[PDB]
């Protein structure tokens, strides 16, 4: 009748999916770091909320970037 075929579906690592499975998170969660661009395995979180809100300074809508 009406053809619609699923050609591709983002899949994670065996260890990734299994981690998310432990955390009850959507299987495609740590795919953010599975990407090619900005990713590694080292960084220290500390920035203060207030700081961040300001770091954002410019408008809140990227429209026009």
């Amino acid at each position: 009748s009406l053809d619609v075929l699923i050609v591709y579906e983002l899949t994670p690592t065996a260890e990734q999916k299994a981690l998310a499975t432990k955390l009850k998170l959507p299987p495609t969660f740590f795919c953010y770091k599975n990407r090619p661009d900005y990713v590694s395995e080292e960084e220290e979180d500390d920035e203060d909320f207030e700081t961040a809100v300001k770091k954002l300074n410019g408008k809140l809508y990227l429209d026009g970037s």
């Binding site: 009406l2 053809d3 699923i6 579906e9």
Partner: protein, 78 residues
Amino acid sequence: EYIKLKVIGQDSSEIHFKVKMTTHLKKLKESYCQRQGVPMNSLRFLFEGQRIADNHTPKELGMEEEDVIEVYQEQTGG
């Protein structure tokens, strides 16, 4: 004929579909849900920011190739 679409969910769940520009987008919608275990309603699909009709089709959206669709978990106020 055939235009590959990118249905991007709201949890990094990406899915690619090849669809005939003569087929009702509902077919696409439905597929998603069952190939994801979620009732036809539970979600909601969007394009160009605006919602997507159940009878819609690129016949109306003029969706080229490489297009993108956003899916949002359905909710209501309280």
